[PDB]
């Protein structure tokens, strides 16, 4: 917009510059469309807001939040169109889609053990950065990660709460939570911190080591807490290095203060990967 204007925002861009297309992922992400940033012949993802919905306040808050973060392993904000409806939030488009489906559909000969370790290392790096900035993710899981070229992985947040139609998210006082990725303190006291993100990261590592399997297979949601309290934890996935599993259990300590920090988790992975 206008550089001299009192309301100048470098991120605001021209709605006309983007060629809007079909909805991304057959609708799995919601009101997110594939687009073409003409000026650069660049394919992008454009999240928008339904036909004037009572969520503008939340939408704009997301946009503001994204303008505050930047890291090679966090989906990159490219611009916004929150001056006049329909509101837009544009980020890069990741060629191979979300990590969950990527892991389930990949060439396992290509996506070997070293590659899995590499993917977990990139994710821990992004979280280490959010930790540093005192930000909290709240919904860390393979489904919220994107895969680019050369196994580049980036953490995102698609606000899947009401989008998912499966048993991943379950109701709780007008809100939905992915019970199998939620820390005990979060299920019991609605307390979310970077430590509950670390617990969720533990589950994510499990998803990665199993090439995308569902957590606590077979166990019904209503008994998960009790079991975690009884000190039950997921077994070491087949082929999962001892060191990585050791990391998993540390993330699953009942007491959050006893869980390693992402700084420690990442430092550990670097050592390993090398
Ligand atoms: C178009 C868009 C708009 C917004 C976002 N937002 C985020 O990804 C995100 C990540 C981290 C935070 C940080 N925030 C801190 C506070 N806590 C509570 C929540 C998280 C916020 C938003 C992503 C996108 N990108 C996006 N969205 C859906 C699908 C895809 C997609 C799908 C397939 C291939 N390529 C891209 N890409
Ligand atoms: Cl500026
Ligand atoms: Cl996807
Ligand atoms: Cl936050
Ligand atoms: Cl890409």
Among 5, 88, 11, 74, smallest CA distance to 45 is for 88
Q: Are residues 89 and 187 in the same domain?
A: no
Q: Are residues 69 and 117 in the same domain?
A: no
Q: What is the best residue among 55, 100, 149, 158 to mutate for testing ligand 1's pocket, by most ligand atoms within 8 Å of CB?
A: 158
Give a yes or no: residue 42 inside a domain.
Answer: yes
Q: Which ligand sits closest to the CA of 1?
A: 2
Q: Are residues 86 and 205 in the same domain?
A: no
Give a yes or no: residue 264 inside a domain.
Answer: yes
**191 is known to lie in a ligand binding site:** no
Q: Are residues 173 and 192 in the same domain?
A: yes
Q: Are residues 130 and 266 in the same domain?
A: yes
Q: Which residues surround ligand 5, an ion (CB under 5 A)?
A: 94-95, 148-149
Q: Are residues 50 and 126 in the same domain?
A: no
What resolution in angstrom units was achieved for this structure? 2.1
Query: What own/partner pairs with CB < 8 Å and gap ≥ 24 does 119-122 have?
Result: 119/151, 119/153, 119/208, 120/204, 120/205, 120/208, 120/244, 120/269, 121/266, 121/269, 121/270, 121/272, 121/273, 122/73, 122/152, 122/153, 122/154
Give a yes or no: residue 216 inside a domain.
Answer: yes
CA distance 274 to 269: 8
Q: Which ligand sits closest to the CA of 29?
A: 1
Give a yes or no: residue 142 inside a domain.
Answer: yes
Q: Are residues 67 and 85 in the same domain?
A: yes
Question: Does residue 197 have an active-site annotation?
Answer: no
- In the listed set 93, 121, 149, which residue is the last one of a domain according to the structure? 93
**Active-site residue (options: 101, 139, 157, 197):** 139
Q: Are residues 268 and 235 in the same domain?
A: yes
Give a yes or no: residue 1 inside a domain.
Answer: no
Q: Which ligand sits closest to the CA of 138?
A: 1
- Residues having CB closer than 6 A to ligand 1 are 24-25, 29, 32, 45-47, 62, 65-66, 75, 89, 91, 93-94, 97, 135-138, 146, 156-158
Q: What is the 3-state secondary structure (H, E, C) of the chain?
A: CCCCCCCCCCCECCHHHEEEEEEHHHHCCCCEEEEEEHHHCEEEEEEECCCCCCCHHHHHHHHHHHCCCCCCCECCEEEEECCCCCCEEEEECCCCCEHHHHHHHCCCCCCCHHHHHHHHHHHHHHHHHHHHCCCCCCCCCHHHEEECHHHCEEECCCCCCCCCCCCCCEEECCEEECHHHCCHHHHHHCCCCHHHHHHHHHHHHHHHHCCCCCCCCCCCHHHHHHHHHCCCCCCCCCCCCHHHHHHHHHHCCCCHHHCCCHHHHHHHHHHHHC
Q: Are residues 252 and 224 in the same domain?
A: yes
Give a yes or no: residue 247 inside a domain.
Answer: yes
Q: Which domain does 27 fall in, by range?
A: 6-93
What contacts 226, CB < 8 A, 6 or more positions away? none
How are beta strands 175-177 and 18-23 bridged, if at all? unpaired
Minimal-distance CA residue to ligand 1 atom 2 = 47
Give a yes or no: residue 204 inside a domain.
Answer: yes
Q: Are residues 147 and 244 in the same domain?
A: yes
Domains contained in the chain, number? 2
Q: What is the CATH number of the domain that holds 152?
A: 1.10.510.10
- In the listed set 93, 124, 144, which residue is the last one of a domain according to the structure? 93
Give a yes or no: residue 181 inside a domain.
Answer: yes
Q: Are residues 200 and 255 in the same domain?
A: yes
**148 is known to lie in a ligand binding site:** no
Q: Are residues 222 and 268 in the same domain?
A: yes
Q: What is each CA distance from 195 to 147, 188, 208, 214, 224, in whole angstroms?
A: 25, 15, 20, 22, 19
Interval between CA 8 and ligand 2 midpoint (Å): 7
């Amino acid at each position: 917009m206008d550089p001299s204007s009192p309301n100048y925002d470098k991120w605001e861009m021209e709605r006309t510059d983007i060629t809007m297309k079909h909805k991304l992922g057959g609708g799995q992400y919601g009101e997110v469309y594939e687009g073409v940033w003409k000026k650069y012949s660049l394919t992008v993802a454009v999240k928008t807001l339904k036909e004037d919905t009572m969520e503008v306040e939340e939408f704009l808050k997301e946009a503001a939040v994204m303008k505050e973060i930047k890291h090679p392993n966090l989906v990159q904000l490219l611009g916004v169109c929150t001056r006049e409806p329909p509101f837009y939030i544009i980020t890069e488009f990741m060629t191979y889609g979300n990590l969950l489906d990527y892991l389930r559909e990949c060439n396992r000969q290509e996506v070997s053990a070293v590659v899995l370790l590499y993917m977990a290392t990139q994710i821990s790096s992004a979280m280490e950065y959010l930790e540093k900035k005192n930000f909290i993710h709240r919904d860390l899981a393979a489904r919220n990660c994107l895969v680019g070229e050369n196994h580049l992985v980036k953490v995102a947040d698609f606000g899947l709460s009401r989008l998912m139609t499966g048993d991943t998210y379950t109701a709780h006082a007008g809100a939905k939570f992915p019970i199998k990725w939620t820390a005990p303190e979060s299920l019991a006291y609605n307390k979310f911190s970077i430590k509950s993100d670390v617990w969720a990261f533990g589950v994510l590592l499990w998803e990665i080591a199993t090439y995308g399997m569902s957590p606590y297979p077979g166990i019904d949601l209503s008994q998960v807490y009790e079991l975690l309290e009884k000190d039950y934890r997921m077994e070491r996935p087949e082929g999962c290095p001892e060191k990585v599993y050791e990391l998993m259990r540390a993330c699953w300590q009942w007491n959050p203060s006893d869980r390693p920090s992402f700084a420690e988790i990442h430092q550990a992975f670097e050592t390993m990967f090398q």
